[PDB]
Design a protein around this ligand. Sequence first.
Ligand SMILES: Nc1ncnc2c1ncn2[C@@H]1O[C@H](COP(=O)(O)OP(=O)(O)O)[C@@H](O)[C@H]1O
Ligand SMILES: [Mg+2]
Lengths: 32, 140, 520, 193
Amino acid sequence: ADAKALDELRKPKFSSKYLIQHVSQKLIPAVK
Amino acid sequence: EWEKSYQPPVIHLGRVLSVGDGIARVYGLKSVQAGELVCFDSGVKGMALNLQADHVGVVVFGNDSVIHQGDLVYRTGQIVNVPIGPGTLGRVTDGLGQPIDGKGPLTNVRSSLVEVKAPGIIARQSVREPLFTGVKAVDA
Amino acid sequence: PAIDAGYVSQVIGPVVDVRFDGELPSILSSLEVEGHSVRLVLEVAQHMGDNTVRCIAMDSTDGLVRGQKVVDTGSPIKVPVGRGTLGRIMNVIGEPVDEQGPIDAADIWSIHREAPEFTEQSTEQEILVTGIKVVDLLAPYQRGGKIGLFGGAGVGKTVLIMELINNVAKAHGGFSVFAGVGERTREGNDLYREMIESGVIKLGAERGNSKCTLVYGQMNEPPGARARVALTGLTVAEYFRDIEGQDVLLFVDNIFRFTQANSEVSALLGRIPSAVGYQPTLATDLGGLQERITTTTKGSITSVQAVYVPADDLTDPAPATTFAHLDATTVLSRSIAELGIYPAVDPLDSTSRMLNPNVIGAEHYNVARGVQKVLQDYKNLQDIIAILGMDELSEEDKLTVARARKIQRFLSQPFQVAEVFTGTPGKYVDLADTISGFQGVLTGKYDDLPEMAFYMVGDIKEVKEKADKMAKDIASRKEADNKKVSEELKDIPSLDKLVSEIKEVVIEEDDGLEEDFKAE
Amino acid sequence: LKLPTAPLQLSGTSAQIATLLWQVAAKENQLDKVQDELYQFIELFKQHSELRRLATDPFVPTLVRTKIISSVLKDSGASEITKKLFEALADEGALSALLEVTVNYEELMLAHKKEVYCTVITAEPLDKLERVELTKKAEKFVDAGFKLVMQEKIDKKLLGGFVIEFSDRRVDMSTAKKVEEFNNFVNKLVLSI
Ligand SMILES: Nc1ncnc2c1ncn2[C@@H]1O[C@H](COP(=O)(O)OP(=O)(O)O)[C@@H](O)[C@H]1O
Ligand SMILES: [Mg+2]
């Protein structure tokens, strides 16, 4: 799927950051 | 006795996904019946035609220009019915049983379904008594 | 109740998608919906692919919710068969609809089976004398063969099927099965009451001496029921053929409604449509149904099926596919009915595999080919007779035209089942009487009679009886009007004496409609 | 084979991923683990443009897509279900489905914790006894022992009472619908009497 539950995914809900701060340390060499 | 026996029935909602070509696609209405009369928030009725896995195909009894994407569709809980009874005698109604002659609401009337199975083999009998049309080319 | 119970996934009219959590049903297996207003039986048509089956409902799906639990019976639609089904009425799922209690079942058979194999086929061509002149002469029916009555919308292929019932079924000895597929419910009630009066269906304690089973899937039924009631009637006939091992008659009124009901369903099973708008699997559905209606070595099924033609078009694929499955074809045409010739059988479009000189004899086959030669030679003269006039043909041509107008009227016949709306008594004609009379018209023994001497008569004696009956009529002018009514003495009363006898009726004061609507 | 059954059935090909993602994370008892792991990618797709290029741009080769997702997820202690999930979507190019798997993973997680998010609209803000009256009155509308989570809003056009908005259905226990339904019943009863 519906829309009104899917507009709520525009908000940050992660409640942990052991991936979002990890991937930027390894995305840019992998795409370069 | 009405007020002591009064239960505000849980109205089941449903958004409109997509309207046009005389048919709305309706998100929601997970408990709606096939062939149920649904009611849009514009006051225009509809009939739940195709119950799909992800939406409900609703054909719209009326002009579908008053239906928007995001409109709410309340189900009425019953298969498509019209008011039948002796209170319809004398009244000019539209295709859903609502009177168009402006003579007020249909009093002394009772809703019954429009989609009834015809009476079976053992329910008939032979046609005996005549129906005179008053046309003598016909009645002769 | 977790496994072996799936839920309704989606409902598209008569097509219900049912989702099972695991251990899906087989195709053709029947399922039951729990908590419907009537018994709703679904029959699995496809495995859609994601633990979803796709079913066809044998009743109306109005009122299904997409969560309803659907139990699986583990078997196809199984109907009662046997001798306790005789004199009863069944619907598509085998339930009784005659209010005579439960059906005493010698067996509970599935309505789906394969056709009998090649080695069980029997090749025996014996004739079936029907009493109908055009049928016995120009397209004779096989006793043990498949018979098709083609025609569309009021040409007379139900009065032909009732005359065939009245003639063949009463003088048969075996059992009959009437499978009413997609027809009028008035006609099914008429047949049930008419078969009660004839003793073919007996009620109550002497019920087992009945000779007919009715299976009715009439035109008020949803398209799942009409697409499968011919299979139920076929199963009731197949039990008598296989297990009881005897000769039966299967009358299927409008086998076209089976094709049409599959064509209604198959628009929603998500398929590309075929030609005129029909399903792609037309020929194989019709074939797999029709290949079960056969005579085998263990029994006989004489199959009389009426076939509707849409828009009076024989090139429509549902009649054109039915044409190959039939031994005797009886094509009823609308223009012959508009000429007053009833039964409106087109003699130049109806055929038989019994019209063979090694089967019916030499003089029968020769008389039939001579009648068809006269009728074809007249059909080739229709344009110049229309636009130039009758007065410009040759003498042999206008002898051919006169003999053809004689044998067109002579092929018509009063039916014993039509005597209630015509007034003429019905005329069963023997086969030898038909051959003798048509040989008489062909050789030229009867060039002297009028044309209307041949119209609606039994045989060659009744054309001469009607000739003197209609040539004493032009001499029928009697003297003095034979009154004996002028002042009859105390036999004819006055008018106020006659109004003095007629009873007063009571007129009940403005329709009384609100007083009994509030009674409920 | 032998998987735990999903809490509720769902739609096609995007919720069927999330049903299967829930059905393997339940055998691992990592239901709250990967629901946190799915949410971190949604902010990750919000940050980097060279990462959501692998889900929308149709000119990246399907080799370079499946190598980059593996070359990033060698590490960080992400659950082995999700690093098997993202390699399944990168081989098929279904990385765009993650925004729709997550919203279908949510209500599977919601019907596993048996919570239902509702919304209460009253005429005045409540008491602490009016709330415990309302909770047990509104517990007759859910179909099991569901932990109801309320939200509170104010509409003075209601003249007392409450409505519940379950986002599927609505029950109107307010006195405004009570009095207009009363007046409809009265004015229809004198239509006959
Ligand atoms: N054998 C017949 N003799 C006379 N009239 C017939 C005959 N068959 C049909 N008719 C006329 O045509 C109509 C159609 O008959 P029926 O057999 O019910 O046709 P169908 O089933 O093809 O519509 C009848 O109501 C009657 O008026
Ligand atoms: Mg008919």
